[PDB]
């Protein structure tokens, strides 16, 4: 026999058998062949044969395992795999602060999270004083992993139950193993259509390969640790996820467990910086910062305290980075602004709906806050002035035609460039006329009016009359995976999330920024009253309209490229009206539906209260909300609030013609259009424009000036979610520096 190892380049000058399974085990002596698992782990040819040979006592145990490993995995069941999976002793790190030595557990002991959580040397003299096995240090040599035969496979991963559709060994888990918020679906399932904020359990994302190139050859270990980390975060999103919390949940045999534990911290911090975990409204204070002291030296001025500014500020603050927020208005929130004065209900003057809760940051934050959302039902009757609910067949007939018009638009645009763009509204019109011409079919006036409702609904979505919006690019964002699942009413209002994000941050109100100078060593920021601020980096999150107006003086000036992109998007607008009543007059006719539609008498009036929203899902209080979109936004600019209220009440008395309607006892009418520091509702792509505009606006300048806000998120434009995510995005970029 020999004392040398098979593996070329192995530094084991004295192989010893860890298995001792054969009554003939060679121990530290001679054997025909030493089989290598790592630089510190070998088993002799006798113990090899003990399992591998049919006439040996350990053959049963190896064939049974070989069967489970077949009905469960995609990797070949080799004896070395069996060894690493079944016989290799566990290692656990002493938890005594001043020791922290790694210890080998005896071969019969099965390591559990509870054992790892509290382990100290000797747990069955000063056991902590016994020297650490010399093999432990070796593990932190980069070549150590390179001479590992097989990649680690985790046991009982917290991620396991979420991945039952994959081969465990394809996602870093062991084939021989084995009440979450329904909105948490972090992992793509096999054969799934795209959905927002999902990762593949079996493939590294582009940014991941960028940060951890050493895993491009074999991503097994990374995926297992990343998947575990996400599972743990979503299992409990109310606490910071730390390495200490993860380590006990890393269960794998062998010295490799030490390498896994050493990697988890790197991956944790990357996940945190990028905003995948330890995020949302989670708050962390002095001596709880989520990123190492290495990121802390730096400073930032954030301009704007809406969802985007507050997202970035929350992230950076939690990171340990010095942040100051400058807000123009006497309040935070921006286009989030809730009226809490209504009886028993919260009514948003701005945003209040969550579009697609699955994996939505907003859904996460509701979880963290213990907030419940109301899922909208599907029903939305199209009610005519005055009284008549639209015939179901007429309804279906015109829905079909409306969407058929969209199909042909999407067909027309395929070969058109930005230089040939035409307005969506004009395109739809032409296609419609040319269809009635082609086919002698003729629609009634009502059928035409129902079509107008649908058109109005497009205008609400874009915040613009359709003759302004791009036929080519109106729905550009759907090129990317969107947020799936329920649309909900955020009944408590977005303001609760806003408050929570801002709590304890350094925020200066009534401080409108007028000048940003990034020509010197650090950014000089000056307010409209001449007050000076300075920091290493600046993030601007002001609304698109304000960038278009040029209310902030940039030195040096924004690029011509940026200006073209800024002007190629539209500062979309809608206004809201809310009305309180003495009683729920609509219950008889509406029958519990979350909303009801209003068939337009004419094309010109189509955006005047097209949809009415019942603002109490408990059906107890009497508040209606409606919207003003498209052409009707203009028609209302010279009308005072009372006049708008009069037209809304006139509309309601028409919609409910065959009954009486009580007078409203309290109401508001929004004027976002003329709020000086906002001047809009949400962005859209103007004719001639491209989705790429969102990317161009998003582009930092010289890693010194950064941009966020709903109009900088190409994937998720318009929304609080999108604005929030753009802030997380920029916080990651800024923290990397």
């Amino acid at each position: 026999g020999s004392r040398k190892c098979e593996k070329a380049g192995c530094t084991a000058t004295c192989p010893v058998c860890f298995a001792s399974a054969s009554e003939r085990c060679a121990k530290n002596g001679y054997t025909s062949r030493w089989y290598h698992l790592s630089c510190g782990e070998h088993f002799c040819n006798e113990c090899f044969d003990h399992y591998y040979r049919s006439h040996k006592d350990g053959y049963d145990k190896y064939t049974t395992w070989k069967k489970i490993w077949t009905s469960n995995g995609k990797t070949e069941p080799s004896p070395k795999a069996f060894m690493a999976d079944q016989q290799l002793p566990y290692w656990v790190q002493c938890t005594k602060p001043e020791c922290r030595k790694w210890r080998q557990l005896t071969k019969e002991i099965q390591l559990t999270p509870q054992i790892a959580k509290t382990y100290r040397c000797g747990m069955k003299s000063d056991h902590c004083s016994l020297p650490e096995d010399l093999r432990v240090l070796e593990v932190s040599n980069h070549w150590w992993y390179s001479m590992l035969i097989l990649p680690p496979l985790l046991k009982d991963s917290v991620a396991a139950p979420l991945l039952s559709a994959y081969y465990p060994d394809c996602v870093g888990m062991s084939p021989s193993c084995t009440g979450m918020n329904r909105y948490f679906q972090p992992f793509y399932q096999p054969n799934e259509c795209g959905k927002a904020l999902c990762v593949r359990p079996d493939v590294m994302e582009l940014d991941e390969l960028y940060e951890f190139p050493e895993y491009s050859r074999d991503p097994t270990m990374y995926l297992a640790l990343r998947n575990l980390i996400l599972a743990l975060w979503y299992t409990n999103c109310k606490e910071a996820l730390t390495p200490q919390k993860c380590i006990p949940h890393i269960i794998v045999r062998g010295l490799v467990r030490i390498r896994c534990v050493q990697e988890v911290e790197r991956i944790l911090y990357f996940m945190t910086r990028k905003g995948l975990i330890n995020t949302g409204v989670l708050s962390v204070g002095a001596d709880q910062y989520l990123l190492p002291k290495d990121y802390h030296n730096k400073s930032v001025i954030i301009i704007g305290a809406g969802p985007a500014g507050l997202a970035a500020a929350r992230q950076l603050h939690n990171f340990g980075i010095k942040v100051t927020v400058l807000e123009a208005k006497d309040r935070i929130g921006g286009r989030v602004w809730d009226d809490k004065s209504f009886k028993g209900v919260t009514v948003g003057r701005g945003a209040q709906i969550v579009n697609g809760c699955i994996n939505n940051p907003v859904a996460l934050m509701c979880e963290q806050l213990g907030i419940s959302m109301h899922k909208f039902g599907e029903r939305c009757d199209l009610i005519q002035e005055g009284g008549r609910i639209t015939d179901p067949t007429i309804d279906k007939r015109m829905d079909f035609h409306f969407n058929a018009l969209l199909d042909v638009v999407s067909e027309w645009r395929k070969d058109k460039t930005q230089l040939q763009d035409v307005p969506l509204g004009e395109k739809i019109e032409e296609i419609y006329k040319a269809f009635i011409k082609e086919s002698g079919i003729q629609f009634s006036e009502l059928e035409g009016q129902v079509l107008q409702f649908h058109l109005s609904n497009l205008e609400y979505a874009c915040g613009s009359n359709l003759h302004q919006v791009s036929a080519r690019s109106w729905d550009h964002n759907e090129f990317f995976a969107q947020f799936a699942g329920d649309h909900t009413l955020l009944t408590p209002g977005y303001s609760v999330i806003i408050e929570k994000l801002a709590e304890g941050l350094d925020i200066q109100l009534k401080s409108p920024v007028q000048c940003i100078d990034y020509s010197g060593d650090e950014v000089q920021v000056t307010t409209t009253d001449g007050t000076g601020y300075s920091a290493q980096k600046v993030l601007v999150t002001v609304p698109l309209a304000l960038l278009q107006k040029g209310a902030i003086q940039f030195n040096p000036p924004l690029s011509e490229k940026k200006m073209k992109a800024i002007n190629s998007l539209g500062a979309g607008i809608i206004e809201k009206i809310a009305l309180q009543f003495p009683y729920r007059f609509w219950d008889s006719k509406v029958q519990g539906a979350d909303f009801f539609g209003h068939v337009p008498p004419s094309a010109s009036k189509r955006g005047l209260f097209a949809v009415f929203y019942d603002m109490d899902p408990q059906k107890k209080h009497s508040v209606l909300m409606s919207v003003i979109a498209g052409e009707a936004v203009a028609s209302v600019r010279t009308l005072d609030d009372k006049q708008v209220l009069q037209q809304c009440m006139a509309t309601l008395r028409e919609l409910f013609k065959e009954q009486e309607v009580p007078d409203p006892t309290k109401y508001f009418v929004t004027r976002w259009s003329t709020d000086p520091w906002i001047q809009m509702a949400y962005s859209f792509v103007k004719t001639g424009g491209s989705g790429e505009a969102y990317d161009i606006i998003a582009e930092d300048i010289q890693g010194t000036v950064f941009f966020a806000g709903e109009a900088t998120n190409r994937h998720f434009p318009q929304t609080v979610t999108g604005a929030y995510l753009s802030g997380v995005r920029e916080a990651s970029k800024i923290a990397a520096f």
Partner: peptide, 26 residues
């Protein structure tokens, strides 16, 4: 954008649906 719609969502004009076909799948 279409994604802003809750009540009475439009459906026409959508690009074909893509479906992840990974090998890691049992």
């Amino acid at each position: 954008a279409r994604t802003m719609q809750t009540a009475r969502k439009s459906t026409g004009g959508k690009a074909p649906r893509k479906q992840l076909a990974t090998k890691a799948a049992r």
